[PDB]
Design a protein around this ligand. Structure first.
Ligand SMILES: Nc1ncnc2c1ncn2[C@@H]1O[C@H](COP(=O)(O)OP(=O)(O)NP(=O)(O)O)[C@@H](O)[C@H]1O
Ligand SMILES: Nc1ncnc2c1ncn2[C@@H]1O[C@H](COP(=O)(O)OP(=O)(O)NP(=O)(O)O)[C@@H](O)[C@H]1O
Ligand SMILES: O=C1CCCN[C@@H]1CCCn1cnc2ccccc2c1=O
Ligand SMILES: O=C1CCCN[C@@H]1CCCn1cnc2ccccc2c1=O
Ligand SMILES: [Mg+2]
Ligand SMILES: [Mg+2]
Ligand SMILES: [Mg+2]
Lengths: 478, 486
């Protein structure tokens, strides 16, 4: 049972929801959390979706070691890297690092495997864990010191083909968030301050948490250019015979995704899981009080529902009350609850409640599969749309710096015309830190959206005064 | 690039050649760690999906617990020298060092003690896929013994021993499948001796394999009946239906990337790898008989058509349309990699509406009409799969000598065979037999020699009454499988 109100104390709400749903268990090593099956099975679904998709692009999976030697890693962040120094009581000759990211592990093998134009495109992915000693406050899913991710890394003959892939991947991240988790996101380009300094252009998919006004990078996909190619000597021979540097990409997305889905659709009763990723779509609860028939129809219903590929549990555990079950599967966010007592049995009917609105329906045995399929689409589409609206009511389109803090104090992002000059962003981060401080924080660029509004002729940068270039989305962030 | 070392003559170099030249493994600067490229990784994905679908059917659920465990928690209760310790992040010293997981009992079991309070919480059945780090003292081998390796580990808790034991055996059966049905590697189910079992458990069942080229047995996977000692240690108790506090009955089980190695070694030959059709990335490689004399479109058009037609029958296909290599170059390339079937399509073939199919395991050739390709290739794949298994099974049973007396031991070892012997199962004798076989192996060493128990097989050959222990001379309980091992 959940008692903190999503709209009052958000961080306590979140903790209760992830704990009492049995998604997360607390752990003694700071920044690390145990992922219990209810949370893990959802990761399995997004993992499979993404994995299948990238496979259709010819990306292949691999596994590179979790250790990188010191001199390889330290060749061109630093404070977050975890170092192994001993085995038993014996010190290693040279300390070794646990993978924070894999560029320095993968790229020397690339330099080696890539020799001609015939060896391209090389497209590889891996699913693994990563360790970073995050200095910021940890949060289950969103920011953990060990997290699970995929990282994709690719090499191409031309910038054209690599950029095409950057976008294809970005679009798969939209789909992971938008089609699987029903979380709206905004495609965009990172400002030169926020991008991966190893690359030429970083693209992003960005999300928003209404309850605390924080934007959050949902995933990332980089046009690396050739900088890593010169650094690692990844070059090939073209059609002619001239040696050329490859054009690279990398891209990653994490268990952070689960966190965002939980915050987006969660309510005061706990989780709400979208049907496309719910391990249990429909839970069937037999009502039993004061004394056998019914258990038999329940089983028939499951088998019916499974021909529709509907994922179904029967909670027929006799050591729990029906009301306990109601509450349990509610807090866990099961999309549909199908009840069945004596009175229903004779009617040939079933009482079904949907988790997102609490609405109830009486539905005859014969109408279940198509009606539940109907209802499940509605829940999914409906969670997305209520979140898309929340997202858009959360962004304020604006023209001057004096608009900012009021918008930030309403826990909103702002969309603003900016000249995209280095200094401004840092000045904006600091002045906003200072105004937040004294109010007793900082606002950064989240992205430059692909979907640009029109920019009239003499429109000015909302902060410098210089002439604006494009519309940039700003806010407080994770 | 061909395989040059002969499998039977220069086994070690053969192994290194086959895994490298086939593009399965790339070498790496940290010892005992290896890169796994797609060609090997894909196989790990196949066995992982298989095993995973099966345990889910049994009510096991997946989870992810942290790779870190505190020193206090790991050291709660000769494993100690293998643990990797993190002492610093960036330039900053930790308050205490932290261990990278070598196995997950000391991370999972305190959580089990929390979650389990009542009979209604039972059974609890979890699994996790993850990597494990152990600073192995022995010489590293790609797949078979690595300092980082991938595995699943399963850990379950039950109200009764009976239900735990049942699970231990259902799991063990899934390990047999993993090897026999997926990788086509024969294995023997058995019970470890007192000396070889997990010391944390009451009984350890195992699935054992045999590598003929070096005569050494190798443990393939493991499944333990843990009893109640861990529940006692970690305080995993539940109130039963009458409110009495009972200890839970536990199991754990694991299988690793080792299994890919066992598969490579079992089916490989002098040309290189042979991959069973059930787990090969590519089952059929289509090779167009082109030189860069031309590309008129006629032959590739048809290769595309065929790919599609086979792809509809769930056959995994690749066209090697690379313009700078001869067909013969390409035959060898895909042989080294172990693609079970090679489809040849040349102008002659195009002229007749046929294609020529060659199977990697025997080299036999088949002329097949386009229309008959899908069903005929499926048939050939079942045949390949079955035949790889049958041949390995016979090499396994030809590698075991049933014996009666200790005098028969060293001759049986020198022929690179295992031995199956009546054994009293007293624990001092296992140690004594290890020592004696070590000393005798050194002495007849011309230039790991110890013979140990591998398992007491579930499949027991007959035991005529009054049979004596091959070593002690006391009455012999059962037959025990022994050998040199990894
Ligand atoms: N500690 C973490 N825990 C979980 N997810 C993370 C963590 N750090 C990053 N991510 C996610 O993984 C994606 C790719 O990682 P990466 O781009 O290396 O992150 P990053 O540059 O360190 N972001 P940030 O730490 O906020 O500056 C990020 O865009 C996040 O969505
Ligand atoms: N270093 C390794 N690399 C790959 N696979 C391994 C490794 N160590 C163990 N395995 C496999 O993992 C299975 C279960 O692990 P576990 O029972 O902990 O092994 P173990 O007791 O360390 N075996 P051993 O080291 O030979 O005494 C073993 O039965 C092996 O098949
Ligand atoms: O986005 C990704 C994900 C895919 C591959 N890597 C890129 C960028 C990684 C950026 N990054 C992020 N934190 C780090 C921490 C320590 C060392 C290095 C890094 C580091 O390189
Ligand atoms: O068999 C398995 C596989 C299933 C899960 N774990 C069990 C027991 C592993 C035994 N083991 C093996 N090497 C270790 C090394 C260091 C510390 C502890 C251990 C250790 O406990
Ligand atoms: Mg970071
Ligand atoms: Mg950053
Ligand atoms: Mg051992």
């Amino acid at each position: 049972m959940v008692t903190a109100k999503k709209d009052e104390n958000f961080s306590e709400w979140y903790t209760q929801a992830i704990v009492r749903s049995e998604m997360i268990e607390y752990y003694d090593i700071s920044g690390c959390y145990i992922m219990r099956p209810w949370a893990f099975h959802i990761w399995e679904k997004v993992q499979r979706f993404f994995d299948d998709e990238i496979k259709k692009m010819g990306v292949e999976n691999s596994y590179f070691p979790m250790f990188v030697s010191r001199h390889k890693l330290e060749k061109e962040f630093s404070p977050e890297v975890a170092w192994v120094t001993h085995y038993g009581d014996s010190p290693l000759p040279e300390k070794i690092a646990i993978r924070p990211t894999s560029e320095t592990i993968m790229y020397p093998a690339y330099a080696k495997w890539i020799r001609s134009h015939r060896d391209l495109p090389l497209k590889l992915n891996q699913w693994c864990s990563v360790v970073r000693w995050e200095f910021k406050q940890p949060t289950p899913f969103l920011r953990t010191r060990e997290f699970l991710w995929q990282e994709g890394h690719t090499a191409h003959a031309t910038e054209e083909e690599a950029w095409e892939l950057v976008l294809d991947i970005l679009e798969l991240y939209r789909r992971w968030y938008e089609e699987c988790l029903a979380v709206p996101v905004i495609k965009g380009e990172k400002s030169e301050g926020e991008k991966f300094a190893g690359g030429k252009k970083t693209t992003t998919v960005e999300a928003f948490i209404p309850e605390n006004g924080r934007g959050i990078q949902a995933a990332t996909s980089h046009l690396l250019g050739t900088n890593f190619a010169k650094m690692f000597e990844i070059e090939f021979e073209d059609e002619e015979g001239h040696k050329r540097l490859v054009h690279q990409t990398s891209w990653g997305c994490t268990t952070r995704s689960l966190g965002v889905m939980i915050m987006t659709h969660g309510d005061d009763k706990g989780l709400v899981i979208p049907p496309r990723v719910a391990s249990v779509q429909v839970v069937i609860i037999p009502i039993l009080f004061k004394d056998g028939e019914i258990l038999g129809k329940c089983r028939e219903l499951k088998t019916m529902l499974e021909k529709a590929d509907i994922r179904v549990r029967i909670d027929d555990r006799s050591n729990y009350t029906p009301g306990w079950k109601y509450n349990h599967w509610e807090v866990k966010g099961v999309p549909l609850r199908l009840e069945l007592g004596p009175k229903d049995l004779a009617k040939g009917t079933a009482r079904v409640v949907r988790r997102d609105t609490g609405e109830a329906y009486q539905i005859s045995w014969a109408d279940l599969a198509p009606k539940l399929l109907e209802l499940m689409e509605g829940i999914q589409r409906s969670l997305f749309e209520k979140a898309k609206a929340r997202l858009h009511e959360g962004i304020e389109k604006i023209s001057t710096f004096d608009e900012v803090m009021p918008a930030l104090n309403r826990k909103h992002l702002v969309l603003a015309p900016w000249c995209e000059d280095p200094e401004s962003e840092e000045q904006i981060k600091k002045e906003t830190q200072k105004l937040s401080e004294i109010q007793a924080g900082a606002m950064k660029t989240l992205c430059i959206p692909f979907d640009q509004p029109p920019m009239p002729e003499g429109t000015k940068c909302f902060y410098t005064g210089k002439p604006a270039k494009r519309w940039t989305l700003w806010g407080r962030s994770y």
